[PDB]
Amino acid sequence: DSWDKDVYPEPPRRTPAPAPQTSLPNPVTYLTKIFDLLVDRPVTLAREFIEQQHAKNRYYYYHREFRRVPDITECEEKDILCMFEAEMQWRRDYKVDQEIVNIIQERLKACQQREGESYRQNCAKELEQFTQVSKAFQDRYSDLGAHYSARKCLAKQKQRMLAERKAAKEAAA
Template sequence: MVEERNPLIRFVNSMYSLIDGPVTFFREKIVEPNQEKYPYYHQKFRRVAGIDECYTDDYVCKFEAQHQFLRDRSVDCEILSILRQRYEHCNTEDLNNRGEEKCEAIYEVYKDAAGAWFAKYGDLGPMPDVLFAFTKQQHRMIWERRHGPVGSGMKEDEFKVEDPDAPRKKP
């Protein structure tokens, strides 16, 4: 290494090594050797029973289902955030081609994911509960069975037969 003759550069280098030395020592001697023994990163939790599989008086099962729901929600929120960032990055990458076909595929994936997120977690409030989410899912399934997919309009009654002799009401 070439020795610096400028006193200002020597001073800056010495201050850098004074601050960086203990950090580098801690990282190389303590953190990296213990990473193999203690796998703190990317911890995988086992899947637990959902709220629909819990008995009404099994509070431990309900507690585990609530925490599983919150973990799933945080993962889904992060996925949605990453998709949003990719779309925004695509739009700001080339300002001349803004709004063209280049980013449409990314936007469609983001829009589908956002719709799925809202269908599952939307309207639950700031402190979502697994039981409310399950009830919301049940209500949505009942609605779709009776009226068709949400957002497609209400389907006509297939079995409704009008009596031709019945008097018609004026509109």
């Protein structure tokens, strides 16, 4: 398909075998057959027509790979050039991260509808997957303000280590 099956996990599709108990004909099989030769077949035929027309000349496209940057924490203070390179590095890290949680959030929604009313127990792993990501997002990007900057993100991160290690060392005694 047009997407990897691992980063979009799909449980195996289990479909029942049609078991006709009532001798009278069911309709739902016939209108599907009627739809098949009235709508589906012309659509596939048209799809095949421009598929071979697409294959006449298929140019390529790729994605611009960005080299790794010395981020803010090693950037020289008041060095605008290294800070600009590093600020963009963190800015790009925000958007890929936003898509990281978008995939997990969307996968969370896919499980809920796929499992019907059994969603509560089936989407338990999916729930904790979102828990491991959503919680990290709060301590990674949340509460940074409209004018967020990696320095403020770095400042918050330094607050986290200082706060948690102070409690950890005091509790350790």
